Coordinates of N, CA and C in Angstrom, one line a residue:
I1 N 4.0 -5.5 -17.8 CA 2.6 -5.0 -17.6 C 2.5 -3.6 -18.3
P2 N 1.3 -3.4 -18.9 CA 1.0 -2.2 -19.6 C 1.1 -1.0 -18.7
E3 N 1.2 0.1 -19.5 CA 1.2 1.5 -18.9 C -0.1 1.9 -18.3
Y4 N -1.2 1.5 -19.0 CA -2.6 1.7 -18.7 C -3.3 0.4 -18.5
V5 N -4.1 0.3 -17.4 CA -5.0 -0.9 -17.2 C -6.4 -0.3 -16.8
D6 N -7.5 -0.7 -17.5 CA -8.8 -0.3 -17.2 C -9.7 -1.5 -17.4
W7 N -10.1 -2.3 -16.3 CA -10.9 -3.4 -16.4 C -12.4 -3.1 -16.9
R8 N -12.7 -1.8 -16.8 CA -14.1 -1.4 -17.2 C -14.1 -1.4 -18.8
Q9 N -13.0 -1.0 -19.3 CA -12.8 -1.0 -20.8 C -12.8 -2.4 -21.3
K10 N -12.2 -3.3 -20.5 CA -12.1 -4.7 -20.9 C -13.4 -5.5 -20.6
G11 N -14.4 -4.8 -20.1 CA -15.7 -5.5 -19.9 C -15.8 -6.4 -18.7
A12 N -14.9 -6.1 -17.7 CA -14.8 -7.0 -16.5 C -15.4 -6.3 -15.2
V13 N -16.1 -5.2 -15.4 CA -16.7 -4.4 -14.3 C -18.1 -3.9 -14.5
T14 N -18.9 -4.3 -13.5 CA -20.4 -3.9 -13.5 C -20.6 -2.5 -13.0
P15 N -21.8 -2.0 -13.3 CA -22.3 -0.7 -12.9 C -21.9 -0.4 -11.4
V16 N -21.8 0.9 -11.1 CA -21.4 1.3 -9.7 C -22.6 1.1 -8.8
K17 N -22.4 0.7 -7.6 CA -23.5 0.5 -6.6 C -23.4 1.5 -5.5
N18 N -24.5 1.6 -4.7 CA -24.5 2.4 -3.5 C -24.8 1.6 -2.3
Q19 N -23.9 1.5 -1.3 CA -24.1 0.6 -0.1 C -25.2 1.2 0.8
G20 N -25.4 2.5 0.6 CA -26.4 3.3 1.4 C -25.9 3.4 2.8
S21 N -26.7 3.4 3.9 CA -26.2 3.6 5.2 C -26.0 2.3 6.0
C22 N -25.2 1.4 5.5 CA -24.9 0.1 6.0 C -23.4 0.0 5.7
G23 N -22.6 -0.4 6.6 CA -21.1 -0.4 6.4 C -20.8 -1.8 5.9
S24 N -21.3 -1.9 4.7 CA -21.2 -3.1 3.9 C -20.2 -3.0 2.8
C25 N -19.3 -2.1 2.8 CA -18.2 -1.8 1.9 C -17.4 -3.1 1.7
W26 N -17.1 -3.8 2.7 CA -16.3 -5.0 2.6 C -16.9 -6.1 1.7
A27 N -18.2 -6.2 1.5 CA -19.0 -7.1 0.8 C -19.1 -6.6 -0.6
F28 N -19.2 -5.3 -0.8 CA -19.2 -4.6 -2.1 C -17.8 -4.8 -2.8
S29 N -16.8 -4.6 -2.0 CA -15.4 -4.7 -2.5 C -15.1 -6.2 -2.9
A30 N -15.4 -7.2 -2.1 CA -15.2 -8.6 -2.4 C -15.9 -8.9 -3.7
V31 N -17.2 -8.4 -3.8 CA -18.0 -8.8 -5.0 C -17.4 -8.2 -6.3
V32 N -16.8 -7.0 -6.3 CA -16.2 -6.5 -7.5 C -15.1 -7.5 -8.0
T33 N -14.3 -8.1 -7.1 CA -13.2 -9.0 -7.4 C -13.7 -10.3 -7.9
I34 N -14.9 -10.7 -7.4 CA -15.5 -12.0 -7.9 C -16.1 -11.8 -9.3
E35 N -16.9 -10.7 -9.6 CA -17.4 -10.4 -10.9 C -16.2 -10.3 -12.0
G36 N -15.1 -9.7 -11.6 CA -13.9 -9.5 -12.4 C -13.2 -10.9 -12.7
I37 N -13.0 -11.7 -11.8 CA -12.2 -13.0 -12.0 C -13.1 -14.0 -12.8
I38 N -14.4 -14.0 -12.6 CA -15.3 -14.9 -13.3 C -15.3 -14.4 -14.8
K39 N -15.4 -13.1 -14.9 CA -15.4 -12.6 -16.4 C -14.0 -13.0 -17.0
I40 N -12.9 -12.8 -16.3 CA -11.6 -13.1 -16.9 C -11.4 -14.5 -17.3
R41 N -11.9 -15.4 -16.3 CA -11.8 -16.9 -16.6 C -12.8 -17.5 -17.4
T42 N -14.1 -17.1 -17.5 CA -15.2 -17.7 -18.2 C -15.6 -17.0 -19.5
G43 N -15.3 -15.7 -19.4 CA -15.8 -14.7 -20.4 C -17.1 -14.2 -20.0
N44 N -17.8 -14.6 -18.9 CA -19.2 -14.2 -18.7 C -19.2 -13.0 -17.7
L45 N -19.9 -11.9 -18.0 CA -19.9 -10.8 -17.0 C -21.3 -10.9 -16.2
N46 N -21.2 -11.2 -14.9 CA -22.4 -11.4 -14.1 C -22.4 -10.4 -12.9
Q47 N -23.5 -10.1 -12.2 CA -23.4 -9.5 -10.9 C -23.7 -10.5 -9.9
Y48 N -22.9 -10.4 -8.8 CA -23.1 -11.3 -7.6 C -23.5 -10.6 -6.3
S49 N -23.9 -11.4 -5.3 CA -24.7 -10.8 -4.2 C -23.8 -10.4 -3.1
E50 N -23.9 -9.0 -2.8 CA -23.3 -8.4 -1.6 C -24.2 -8.8 -0.3
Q51 N -25.5 -8.9 -0.5 CA -26.4 -9.1 0.6 C -26.1 -10.4 1.1
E52 N -25.7 -11.4 0.2 CA -25.4 -12.7 0.7 C -24.2 -12.8 1.6
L53 N -23.2 -12.0 1.3 CA -22.0 -12.0 2.2 C -22.4 -11.3 3.5
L54 N -23.1 -10.2 3.4 CA -23.6 -9.4 4.6 C -24.4 -10.3 5.6
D55 N -25.2 -11.2 5.1 CA -26.0 -12.1 5.9 C -25.2 -13.2 6.5
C56 N -24.3 -13.7 5.6 CA -23.6 -15.0 5.9 C -22.2 -14.9 6.4
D57 N -21.5 -13.8 6.3 CA -20.2 -13.9 6.8 C -20.2 -13.6 8.3
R58 N -20.1 -14.6 9.1 CA -20.3 -14.3 10.6 C -18.9 -14.0 11.2
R59 N -17.8 -13.9 10.5 CA -16.5 -13.4 11.0 C -16.6 -11.9 10.9
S60 N -17.4 -11.3 10.0 CA -17.5 -9.9 9.7 C -18.7 -9.4 10.6
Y61 N -19.0 -8.1 10.5 CA -19.9 -7.5 11.5 C -21.1 -6.8 10.9
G62 N -21.7 -7.4 9.8 CA -22.8 -6.9 9.0 C -22.6 -5.4 8.6
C63 N -23.6 -4.6 9.0 CA -23.7 -3.2 8.7 C -22.7 -2.4 9.5
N64 N -21.9 -3.0 10.3 CA -20.9 -2.4 11.1 C -19.5 -2.7 10.6
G65 N -19.3 -3.1 9.3 CA -18.0 -3.3 8.9 C -17.7 -4.8 8.9
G66 N -16.5 -5.1 8.3 CA -16.2 -6.6 8.1 C -15.0 -6.7 7.2
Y67 N -14.7 -7.9 6.8 CA -13.3 -8.1 6.2 C -13.5 -8.6 4.8
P68 N -12.8 -7.9 3.8 CA -13.0 -8.4 2.4 C -12.4 -9.8 2.2
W69 N -11.3 -10.1 3.0 CA -10.6 -11.4 3.0 C -11.4 -12.5 3.6
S70 N -12.3 -12.2 4.6 CA -13.2 -13.2 5.1 C -14.3 -13.5 4.1
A71 N -14.9 -12.4 3.5 CA -15.9 -12.6 2.4 C -15.4 -13.4 1.2
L72 N -14.1 -13.2 0.9 CA -13.5 -13.9 -0.3 C -13.3 -15.4 0.1
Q73 N -13.0 -15.6 1.4 CA -12.8 -17.0 1.9 C -14.1 -17.7 1.9
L74 N -15.2 -17.1 2.2 CA -16.5 -17.6 2.2 C -16.9 -18.0 0.7
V75 N -16.6 -17.2 -0.2 CA -17.0 -17.6 -1.7 C -16.2 -18.8 -2.2
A76 N -14.9 -18.9 -1.7 CA -14.1 -20.1 -1.9 C -14.5 -21.4 -1.2
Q77 N -15.2 -21.2 0.0 CA -15.7 -22.3 0.8 C -17.0 -22.8 0.3
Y78 N -17.9 -21.8 0.1 CA -19.3 -22.1 -0.2 C -19.7 -21.8 -1.7
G79 N -19.5 -20.5 -2.0 CA -19.8 -19.9 -3.3 C -20.7 -18.7 -3.1
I80 N -21.2 -18.2 -4.2 CA -22.1 -17.0 -4.1 C -23.2 -17.1 -5.1
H81 N -24.4 -16.6 -4.9 CA -25.5 -16.5 -5.8 C -25.4 -15.2 -6.7
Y82 N -26.1 -15.1 -7.8 CA -26.3 -13.9 -8.6 C -27.1 -12.9 -7.7
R83 N -26.7 -11.6 -8.0 CA -27.2 -10.5 -7.3 C -28.8 -10.5 -7.4
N84 N -29.3 -10.8 -8.6 CA -30.7 -11.0 -9.0 C -31.5 -12.0 -8.1
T85 N -30.8 -13.0 -7.7 CA -31.5 -14.1 -6.9 C -31.4 -13.7 -5.4
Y86 N -30.5 -12.8 -5.1 CA -30.3 -12.4 -3.7 C -29.9 -10.9 -3.6
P87 N -30.9 -10.1 -3.8 CA -30.7 -8.6 -4.0 C -30.4 -7.9 -2.6
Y88 N -29.8 -6.7 -2.8 CA -29.3 -5.9 -1.7 C -30.5 -5.3 -0.9
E89 N -30.4 -5.3 0.4 CA -31.4 -4.6 1.3 C -30.8 -3.6 2.2
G90 N -29.5 -3.6 2.5 CA -28.8 -2.6 3.3 C -29.1 -2.8 4.7
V91 N -29.5 -4.0 5.1 CA -29.7 -4.5 6.5 C -29.3 -5.9 6.6
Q92 N -28.6 -6.3 7.7 CA -28.3 -7.7 7.9 C -29.5 -8.5 8.3
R93 N -29.6 -9.7 7.6 CA -30.7 -10.6 7.8 C -30.1 -12.0 8.1
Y94 N -31.0 -13.0 8.1 CA -30.7 -14.4 8.2 C -29.9 -14.8 7.0
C95 N -28.9 -15.7 7.0 CA -28.3 -16.2 5.8 C -29.3 -17.2 5.1
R96 N -29.6 -16.8 3.8 CA -30.7 -17.5 3.1 C -30.1 -18.2 1.9
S97 N -28.8 -18.4 1.9 CA -28.1 -19.1 0.8 C -28.9 -20.3 0.3
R98 N -29.1 -21.1 1.3 CA -29.7 -22.5 1.4 C -31.0 -22.5 0.7
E99 N -31.8 -21.5 0.9 CA -33.1 -21.3 0.3 C -33.1 -20.8 -1.1
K100 N -32.0 -20.5 -1.8 CA -32.0 -19.9 -3.1 C -31.5 -20.8 -4.1
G101 N -31.2 -22.1 -3.7 CA -30.7 -23.0 -4.7 C -29.2 -22.9 -4.6
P102 N -28.6 -23.7 -5.6 CA -27.2 -23.9 -5.8 C -26.6 -22.5 -6.0
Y103 N -25.4 -22.4 -5.6 CA -24.6 -21.2 -5.8 C -24.4 -21.1 -7.3
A104 N -24.1 -19.8 -7.7 CA -23.8 -19.5 -9.1 C -22.3 -19.5 -9.4
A105 N -21.4 -19.3 -8.5 CA -20.0 -19.3 -8.7 C -19.3 -19.7 -7.5
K106 N -18.1 -20.2 -7.6 CA -17.3 -20.6 -6.4 C -15.8 -20.4 -6.9
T107 N -14.9 -20.0 -6.0 CA -13.5 -19.8 -6.4 C -12.6 -20.9 -5.8
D108 N -11.3 -20.8 -6.1 CA -10.4 -21.8 -5.6 C -9.4 -21.3 -4.6
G109 N -9.7 -20.1 -4.0 CA -8.9 -19.7 -2.8 C -8.8 -18.2 -2.8
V110 N -7.9 -17.7 -2.0 CA -7.8 -16.2 -1.8 C -6.3 -16.0 -1.6
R111 N -5.7 -14.9 -2.1 CA -4.4 -14.5 -1.9 C -4.3 -13.1 -1.4
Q112 N -3.3 -12.8 -0.7 CA -3.0 -11.4 -0.2 C -1.9 -10.9 -1.0
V113 N -1.9 -9.6 -1.4 CA -0.7 -9.0 -2.1 C 0.2 -8.6 -1.0
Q114 N 1.5 -8.7 -1.4 CA 2.6 -8.2 -0.4 C 2.2 -6.8 0.0
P115 N 2.1 -6.4 1.3 CA 1.7 -5.1 1.7 C 2.8 -4.1 1.5
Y116 N 2.4 -2.9 1.5 CA 3.3 -1.7 1.4 C 4.2 -1.8 0.2
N117 N 3.7 -2.2 -1.0 CA 4.5 -2.4 -2.2 C 3.7 -2.0 -3.3
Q118 N 3.9 -0.8 -3.9 CA 3.1 -0.3 -5.1 C 3.3 -1.3 -6.2
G119 N 4.5 -1.7 -6.5 CA 4.8 -2.6 -7.6 C 4.0 -3.9 -7.5
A120 N 3.9 -4.5 -6.4 CA 3.2 -5.8 -6.2 C 1.7 -5.6 -6.4
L121 N 1.2 -4.4 -5.9 CA -0.2 -4.0 -6.1 C -0.5 -3.9 -7.6
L122 N 0.3 -3.2 -8.4 CA 0.1 -2.9 -9.8 C 0.2 -4.2 -10.7
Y123 N 1.1 -5.1 -10.2 CA 1.1 -6.3 -11.0 C -0.1 -7.1 -10.8
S124 N -0.6 -7.1 -9.6 CA -2.0 -7.7 -9.3 C -3.1 -7.1 -10.2
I125 N -3.3 -5.8 -10.1 CA -4.3 -5.1 -11.0 C -4.2 -5.5 -12.4
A126 N -3.0 -5.6 -12.9 CA -2.7 -6.0 -14.3 C -3.3 -7.3 -14.6
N127 N -3.6 -8.2 -13.6 CA -4.1 -9.5 -13.7 C -5.5 -9.6 -13.4
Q128 N -6.0 -8.7 -12.5 CA -7.5 -8.7 -12.2 C -7.8 -7.6 -11.2
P129 N -9.1 -7.4 -11.0 CA -9.5 -6.4 -10.0 C -9.1 -7.0 -8.6
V130 N -8.7 -6.1 -7.7 CA -8.2 -6.4 -6.4 C -9.0 -5.6 -5.4
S131 N -9.1 -6.2 -4.2 CA -9.7 -5.5 -3.0 C -8.6 -4.8 -2.2
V132 N -8.9 -3.5 -1.9 CA -8.0 -2.7 -1.2 C -8.8 -1.8 -0.1
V133 N -8.0 -1.3 0.8 CA -8.5 -0.5 1.9 C -7.7 0.9 1.8
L134 N -8.4 1.9 2.4 CA -7.9 3.3 2.5 C -8.7 4.0 3.6
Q135 N -8.2 5.1 4.0 CA -8.8 6.1 5.0 C -9.9 6.9 4.2
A136 N -11.1 6.7 4.6 CA -12.2 7.5 3.9 C -12.8 8.6 4.8
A137 N -12.4 8.5 6.0 CA -13.1 9.4 7.0 C -12.7 10.9 6.8
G138 N -11.6 11.2 6.2 CA -11.2 12.6 6.0 C -12.2 13.3 5.0
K139 N -12.5 14.6 5.3 CA -13.5 15.4 4.6 C -13.1 15.5 3.1
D140 N -11.8 15.5 2.8 CA -11.4 15.7 1.4 C -11.8 14.4 0.6
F141 N -11.6 13.3 1.2 CA -12.0 12.0 0.5 C -13.6 12.0 0.3
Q142 N -14.3 12.4 1.4 CA -15.8 12.5 1.2 C -16.3 13.5 0.3
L143 N -15.7 14.6 0.1 CA -16.2 15.7 -0.8 C -15.6 15.7 -2.1
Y144 N -14.8 14.6 -2.5 CA -14.2 14.5 -3.8 C -15.2 14.3 -4.9
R145 N -15.0 15.1 -5.9 CA -15.8 15.2 -7.1 C -15.0 15.0 -8.4
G146 N -13.7 14.8 -8.5 CA -13.1 14.4 -9.7 C -11.6 14.9 -9.6
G147 N -10.8 14.4 -10.6 CA -9.4 14.7 -10.6 C -8.6 13.7 -9.9
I148 N -7.2 13.8 -10.0 CA -6.3 12.8 -9.3 C -6.2 13.3 -7.9
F149 N -6.7 12.4 -7.0 CA -6.7 12.7 -5.6 C -5.3 12.3 -5.0
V150 N -4.9 13.4 -4.3 CA -3.6 13.5 -3.7 C -3.7 13.7 -2.2
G151 N -4.9 13.6 -1.7 CA -5.1 13.8 -0.2 C -5.5 15.3 0.0
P152 N -5.3 15.7 1.2 CA -4.8 15.1 2.4 C -5.7 14.0 3.0
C153 N -4.9 13.0 3.6 CA -5.5 11.9 4.2 C -4.3 11.1 4.9
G154 N -4.7 10.5 6.0 CA -3.7 9.7 6.8 C -3.7 8.3 6.3
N155 N -3.4 7.4 7.2 CA -3.4 6.0 7.0 C -4.2 5.2 8.0
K156 N -5.3 5.7 8.6 CA -6.1 5.1 9.5 C -7.3 4.5 8.6
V157 N -6.8 3.4 7.9 CA -7.7 2.8 6.9 C -8.9 2.3 7.6
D158 N -10.1 2.6 7.0 CA -11.4 2.3 7.5 C -12.4 1.9 6.4
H159 N -12.1 1.8 5.2 CA -13.1 1.6 4.1 C -12.5 0.7 3.1
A160 N -13.3 -0.3 2.6 CA -12.8 -1.3 1.6 C -13.5 -0.9 0.3
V161 N -12.7 -0.9 -0.8 CA -13.0 -0.5 -2.2 C -12.3 -1.5 -3.1
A162 N -12.4 -1.2 -4.4 CA -11.8 -2.2 -5.4 C -11.0 -1.5 -6.4
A163 N -9.7 -1.9 -6.6 CA -8.9 -1.3 -7.6 C -9.1 -2.0 -8.9
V164 N -9.5 -1.2 -9.9 CA -9.9 -1.8 -11.2 C -9.0 -1.3 -12.4
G165 N -7.9 -0.6 -12.0 CA -7.0 -0.2 -13.1 C -6.0 0.8 -12.5
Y166 N -5.2 1.3 -13.5 CA -4.1 2.2 -13.2 C -3.7 2.9 -14.5
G167 N -2.9 3.9 -14.2 CA -2.2 4.7 -15.3 C -0.9 5.3 -14.7
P168 N -0.3 6.1 -15.4 CA 1.1 6.6 -15.1 C 1.1 7.2 -13.8
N169 N 0.1 7.9 -13.3 CA 0.1 8.6 -12.1 C -1.1 8.3 -11.2
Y170 N -1.9 7.3 -11.4 CA -3.1 7.1 -10.5 C -3.3 5.6 -10.4
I171 N -4.2 5.2 -9.5 CA -4.7 3.8 -9.4 C -6.2 4.1 -9.5
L172 N -6.9 3.4 -10.3 CA -8.3 3.6 -10.5 C -9.2 2.8 -9.6
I173 N -9.9 3.5 -8.7 CA -10.7 2.8 -7.7 C -12.3 2.8 -7.9
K174 N -13.0 1.7 -7.8 CA -14.4 1.7 -7.8 C -14.9 1.7 -6.4
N175 N -15.6 2.8 -6.0 CA -16.3 2.9 -4.7 C -17.7 2.4 -4.8
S176 N -18.3 2.4 -3.5 CA -19.7 1.9 -3.4 C -20.5 3.0 -2.8
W177 N -20.3 4.2 -3.3 CA -21.2 5.3 -2.8 C -22.0 5.9 -3.9
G178 N -22.5 5.1 -4.9 CA -23.3 5.5 -5.9 C -22.5 6.4 -6.9
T179 N -23.3 6.9 -7.9 CA -22.9 7.7 -9.0 C -22.5 9.1 -8.6
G180 N -23.2 9.5 -7.6 CA -23.2 10.9 -7.1 C -21.9 11.3 -6.4
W181 N -20.9 10.4 -6.4 CA -19.6 10.7 -5.7 C -18.5 10.4 -6.7
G182 N -17.5 11.3 -6.6 CA -16.3 11.1 -7.5 C -16.6 11.3 -8.9
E183 N -15.9 10.6 -9.7 CA -16.1 10.6 -11.2 C -17.0 9.4 -11.6
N184 N -18.3 9.7 -11.4 CA -19.4 8.7 -11.6 C -19.2 7.5 -10.7
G185 N -18.8 7.7 -9.5 CA -18.6 6.6 -8.5 C -17.2 6.1 -8.4
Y186 N -16.2 6.6 -9.2 CA -14.8 6.1 -9.2 C -14.0 7.2 -8.6
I187 N -12.7 6.8 -8.2 CA -11.7 7.9 -7.8 C -10.4 7.4 -8.5
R188 N -9.7 8.4 -8.9 CA -8.3 8.2 -9.3 C -7.3 8.7 -8.2
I189 N -6.6 7.8 -7.6 CA -5.8 8.2 -6.4 C -4.3 8.2 -6.9
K190 N -3.6 9.3 -6.5 CA -2.2 9.4 -6.9 C -1.4 8.2 -6.4
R191 N -0.5 7.8 -7.4 CA 0.6 6.8 -7.0 C 1.9 7.4 -7.3
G192 N 2.9 6.6 -7.0 CA 4.3 6.8 -7.4 C 5.0 8.0 -6.7
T193 N 4.7 8.2 -5.5 CA 5.2 9.2 -4.7 C 6.3 8.7 -3.7
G194 N 6.5 7.4 -3.7 CA 7.5 6.8 -2.8 C 7.0 6.5 -1.4
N195 N 5.8 6.9 -1.1 CA 5.1 6.6 0.2 C 4.7 5.1 0.2
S196 N 5.2 4.4 1.2 CA 5.0 3.0 1.4 C 3.6 2.5 1.8
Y197 N 2.9 3.3 2.6 CA 1.5 3.1 3.0 C 0.6 3.3 1.8
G198 N 1.1 4.1 0.8 CA 0.2 4.5 -0.3 C -0.6 5.7 0.2
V199 N -1.1 6.5 -0.8 CA -2.0 7.6 -0.4 C -3.2 7.1 0.2
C200 N -3.6 7.7 1.4 CA -4.7 7.2 2.2 C -4.6 5.7 2.7
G201 N -3.3 5.3 2.8 CA -2.9 4.0 3.3 C -3.3 2.9 2.3
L202 N -3.4 3.2 1.0 CA -3.9 2.2 0.0 C -3.1 1.0 -0.1
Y203 N -1.8 0.9 0.4 CA -1.1 -0.4 0.2 C -1.0 -1.2 1.5
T204 N -2.1 -1.0 2.4 CA -2.2 -1.6 3.7 C -2.6 -3.1 3.6
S205 N -3.7 -3.3 2.9 CA -4.3 -4.7 2.9 C -5.0 -5.0 1.7
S206 N -4.4 -5.8 0.8 CA -5.0 -6.1 -0.5 C -5.1 -7.6 -0.8
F207 N -6.2 -8.0 -1.3 CA -6.5 -9.5 -1.5 C -7.2 -9.6 -2.9
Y208 N -7.3 -10.9 -3.3 CA -8.0 -11.2 -4.6 C -8.2 -12.7 -4.5
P209 N -9.3 -13.1 -5.1 CA -9.7 -14.5 -5.3 C -8.9 -15.1 -6.4
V210 N -8.7 -16.4 -6.4 CA -8.0 -17.3 -7.3 C -9.2 -18.2 -7.9
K211 N -9.1 -18.3 -9.2 CA -10.0 -19.2 -9.9 C -9.2 -19.9 -11.0
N212 N -9.2 -21.2 -11.0 CA -8.5 -22.1 -11.9 C -9.3 -22.3 -13.3

């Protein structure tokens, strides 16, 4: 695997979104991984619906959090519509899949990366965008405005984000707090320090869709 990976540069990543005041990060995270794998496998770059997972994943808790792996499982079971056909509202509603016509994409399964392993995480990113969790509740993570983030932060993971690249010393993360946070909505988190949890517990729980 390359020294540098940036899926944004490769055309596999859509504009940064803002989840607003709804703890819909799980759905935002899952959707980056779907936009990424459809681009990789078809060549087409589309945006898909976070709102649809929010409404329809009843394993998850709407605006109160949820599971990127449950959302990924849903897109493998049923599929997902374009963002355009099912736009974000930042509130949980009725699942309206049914009323929007056929799904626009569907995957062939979900896999989990071996936890607590930087190497296994980096080999995944080299292949496609991956969904990861980290502790976002610390003031330092919240007030970040740029540079390689080294903490401080614990490992009480509470936020789902998408890893879209890496370099020699960082893992490149796409957040869902709009442009106004980090480096135009992105964070570079330090890697390669020998910490097994990863900085802000980044190697805790990482999944990605499979598409044949």
